[PDB]
Amino acid sequence: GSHYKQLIKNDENITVNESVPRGRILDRNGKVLVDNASKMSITYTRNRKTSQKEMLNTAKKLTDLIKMDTDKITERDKKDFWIQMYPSSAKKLMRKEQLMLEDGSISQDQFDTQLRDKIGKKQLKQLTKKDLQVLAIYREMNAGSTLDPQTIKNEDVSEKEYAAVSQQLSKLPGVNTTMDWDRKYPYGDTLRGIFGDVSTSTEGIPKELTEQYLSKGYSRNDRVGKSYLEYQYEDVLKGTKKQMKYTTDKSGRVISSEVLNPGSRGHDLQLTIDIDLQKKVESLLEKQISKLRSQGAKDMDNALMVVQNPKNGDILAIAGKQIDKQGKLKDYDIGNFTAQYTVGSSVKGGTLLAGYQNKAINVGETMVDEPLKFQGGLTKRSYFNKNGHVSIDDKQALMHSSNVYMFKTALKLAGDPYTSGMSLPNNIADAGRKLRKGLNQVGLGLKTGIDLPNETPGQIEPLTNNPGNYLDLAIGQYDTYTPLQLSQYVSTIANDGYRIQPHIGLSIYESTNKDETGPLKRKIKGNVLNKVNNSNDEIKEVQEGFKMAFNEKQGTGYASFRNTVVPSAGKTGTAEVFQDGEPRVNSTYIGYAPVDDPKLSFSIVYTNQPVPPPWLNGGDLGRDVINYYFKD
Numbered sequence: 191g192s193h194y195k196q197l198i199k200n201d202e203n204i205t206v207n208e209s210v211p212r213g214r215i216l217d218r219n220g221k222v223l224v225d226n227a228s229k230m231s232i233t234y235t236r237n238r239k240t241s242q243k244e245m246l247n248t249a250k251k252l253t254d255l256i257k258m259d260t261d262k263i264t265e266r267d268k269k270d271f272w273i274q275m276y277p278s279s280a281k282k283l284m285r286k287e288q289l290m291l292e293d294g295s296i297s298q299d300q301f302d303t304q305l306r307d308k309i310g311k312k313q314l315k316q317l318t319k320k321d322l323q324v325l326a327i328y329r330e331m332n333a334g335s336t337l338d339p340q341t342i343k344n345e346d347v348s349e350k351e352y353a354a355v356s357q358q359l360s361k362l363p364g365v366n367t368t369m370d371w372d373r374k375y376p377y378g379d380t381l382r383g384i385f386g387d388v389s390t391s392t393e394g395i396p397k398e399l400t401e402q403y404l405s406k407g408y409s410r411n412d413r414v415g416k417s418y419l420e421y422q423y424e425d426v427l428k429g430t431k432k433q434m435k436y437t438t439d440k441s442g443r444v445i446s447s448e449v450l451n452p453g454s455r456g457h458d459l460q461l462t463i464d465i466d467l468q469k470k471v472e473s474l475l476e477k478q479i480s481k482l483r484s485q486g487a488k489d490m491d492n493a494l495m496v497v498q499n500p501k502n503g504d505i506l507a508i509a510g511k512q513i514d515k516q517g518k519l520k521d522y523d524i525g526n527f528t529a530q531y532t533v534g535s536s537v538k539g540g541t542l543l544a545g546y547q548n549k550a551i552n553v554g555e556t557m558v559d560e561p562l563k564f565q566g567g568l569t570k571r572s573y574f575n576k577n578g579h580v581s582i583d584d585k586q587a588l589m590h591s592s593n594v595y596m597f598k599t600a601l602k603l604a605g606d607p608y609t610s611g612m613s614l615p616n617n618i619a620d621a622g623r624k625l626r627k628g629l630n631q632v633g634l635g636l637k638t639g640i641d642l643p644n645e646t647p648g649q650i651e652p653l654t655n656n657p658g659n660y661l662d663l664a665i666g667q668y669d670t671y672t673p674l675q676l677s678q679y680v681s682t683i684a685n686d687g688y689r690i691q692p693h694i695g696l697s698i699y700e701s702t703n704k705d706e707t708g709p710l711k712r713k714i715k716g717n718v719l720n721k722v723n724n725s726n727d728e729i730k731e732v733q734e735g736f737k738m739a740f741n742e743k744q745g746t747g748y749a750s751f752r753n754t755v756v757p758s759a760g761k762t763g764t765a766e767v768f769q770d771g772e773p774r775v776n777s778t779y780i781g782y783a784p785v786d787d788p789k790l791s792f793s794i795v796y797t798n799q800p801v802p803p804p805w806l807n808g809g810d811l812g813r814d815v816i817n818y819y820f821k822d
C-alpha cells in the first residue's frame with residue numbers, strides 16, 4: 191500500500207520517499223474505532239496503437255485469473271463483442287449488404303449500423319458465461335485512451351486474484367495491480383462525523399487546505415486528514431515516511447545506497463470515548479426522540495447530548511441527531527460544539543455566581559418572587575408564580591427556576607435595584623460586561639477548548655442601552671450556547687469550581703508494530719482553564735439548589751431525576767423560540783452524579799418542542815444514561 195510521492199534530484203543524487211501506514215484510533219478501553227484496510231485494484235493502460243484483437247487477447251488471459259461483475263455491459267457492448275465472437279455468423283447475416291459495401295453503394299458506417307440492427311433475437315444468446323467475463327474486462331479496457339490507466343476491478347479484488355495477476359504482468363501487456371489503504375470503521379456509522387476523513391489519494395491535499403499543508407513540508411500527492419479528528423491529530427497519526435538516498439553517475443548506475451529513514455507507522459491515538467457508552471447513549475437518544483414525538487413533539491428537529499467526566503474533562507460520549515418532520519434521523523454529533531442555541535433557565539447557576547462575585551447578592555439572600563412592573567406597564571414574571579408573591583432563597587430560586595430572582599440580581603448588578611414602576615437602566619454596558627464575565631468563568635460564552643476544529647463560542651450581541659436584552663441574558667434568553675458549553679459549565683459546578691478543557695483525545699502511543707499499541711508516548715490532558723472567582727460557600731449554594739431542583743417535589747427536574755440509581759443534581763431550561771411563525775421551545779438539561787463525588791456530568795438540548803402546558807420529560811434521557819452508567 192506504499193506509494194512513493196517524492197523523487198528529489200541533486201548531485202546526480204536521488205532521494206525517494208515511501209509512504210507509511212496511518213495510526214489507529216482507539217476508545218478508552220483499547221477497542222479499535224478507526225483502522226486501516228488494504229484495497230487492491232486491477233488496472234489497464236491503453237497505448238497509442240494497441241489493437242482491438244490484442245485487448246481481447248489480454249482480457250481473455252485475465253478471465254483465467256479473476257472473476258468479474260457482468261453489470262455495466264451495455265447492449266452496444268454485447269453486439270460489438272458478438273461480431274468477433276463468431277465472424278462467419280456476422281458474415282452470414284450481411285450477405286447482401288457486404289456486396290453493396292464492395293460495390294461502393296453503401297458506406298462502412300451504413301453497413302455497421304445495419305449489422306448491429308440485425309440481431310438481438312435467439313442469436314445474441316450465443317454469449318457463453320466466459321464471453322461475458324472477457325467482455326466485462328474488454329469494456330473497461332476501452333474507456334478513454336492515452337496512457338491514463340482505466341480500472342478493471344476495484345471492489346471485491348481478492349488476494350488470490352491480486353497474486354495471480356501480479357505474477358503474470360509480464361504476460362499481460364498494459365495490465366497492472368495496485369495496493370492501497372483505506373480507513374476501516376469497525377463500529378459502522380457511530381461517531382464518523384467526529385472521526386473525520388482522510389483525503390482519497392486521487393485527491394491529495396484538498397484545495398481548501400493546501401498551502402497550510404505545503405508550509406509544513408508535505409506534497410500535493412500526500413493523503414492527509416481532511417476534517418475533525420483526522421485533521422486535528424494529523425501529525426501524530428501520520429507516519430514518518432521511508433526515505434532512501436541514491437548516488438549515481440554517468441548514465442545512472444547506483445554506486446551507493448543510503449537509508450536516510452527506514453520509516454515508521456503513525457502513532458495510535460486513544461480517545462476518552464467509551465464506545466459502549468456511546469452506543470448506549472445513541473440508542474437511548476433515538477428511543478427518547480421517538481417517545482417525545484409520540485407525545486406531540488413532531489417539529490423537534492435537533493436532539494443533542496454530551497457526557498463527560500467532570501473531574502478531568504474526558505468526553506465519554508457525544509451524540510446528536512437532526513430530525514425531520516417524519517422523525518427520520520441524520521447523525522449530527524458535531525453539533526454539540528459547532529451549533530449554538532437559546533438554552534434558557536439552565537444558565538441560572540452561572541447568573542448567581544456572577545451576582546455573588548460582584549457583591550450584588552449574598553449567599554442565602556431571600557427576595558420576593560412576584561410580577562415585576564416597569565415604566566409604561568411592561569411586566570416580567572416567573573413561570574411558576576405568574577400571579578402570587580413568594581419569598582425565596584437563591585437555592586429555592588434554582589429549584590423553582592425563578593426568573594424574578596435573577597432579574598432582581600441583574601438589576602442590583604446594574605446598580606439600580608428594582609422598585610415598582612421604575613424605568614429600566616438606560617446604559618447597562620458595564621453591568622452586561624460583568625454578567626458576561628461571570629458566565630464566561632463557568633464556560634458560558636467562551637470556547638470550551640475542545641481538541642477539535644470549528645468550535646463556536648455562541649452568538650454574543652452588543653450590550654449597551656438594551657436593558658431588556660440584559661435581563662434576558664440573566665435567564666438564558668439572549669446569548670446562545672453550545673451543548674458542550676452547558677456540559678463544561680455543569681462540570682465546573684460538579685467539580686467545585688474548576689473549569690476544565692473538554693477533550694476527546696486521551697493518549698498517544700509510540701506505535702511501531704502492526705496491530706499493537708506499543709508503549710504510551712504522551713497523555714492528552716484536560717487543562718484547568720480557571721477556577722471560578724467564588725468562595726466555597728457560593729459554589730456549594732449553587733450545588734445545593736441544583737440538588738433541590740432534581741430531588742425536591744417542587745424542583746423542575748423531580749419527575750425525571752428523583753429516583754436515579756445514585757443521587758443526581760442539575761438544572762433545567764425551557765426557552766421560547768419560533769419556527770415559521772409558530773411558538774416552540776428549546777428544552778435543556780444539565781446534571782451530574784453522584785452528588786457527593788461526581789464522576790459523570792451531561793448536557794442535553796432539544797430544539798423546537800411544543801410550548802408546554804403539557805410538560806414533556808426529555809430529561810428522562812439523562813436519568814436513563816445515569817442509571818445505565820451506575821448500573822453496577
Ligand SMILES: *[B@@]1([O])O[C]([C]C([O])=O)[C][C][C]1[N]C(=O)[C]C1=[C][C]=[C]S1
Pocket residue numbers: 533534535536572573574591592593665666746761762763764765766775801802
Ligand atoms: B427558563 O428557561 O426555564 C424555566 C423552566 C425550566 O427550568 O425548564 C421557566 C422560566 C424560564 N423560561 C421562560 O420564562 C419562558 C418559558 C417557555 C415555556 C414555559 S416558560
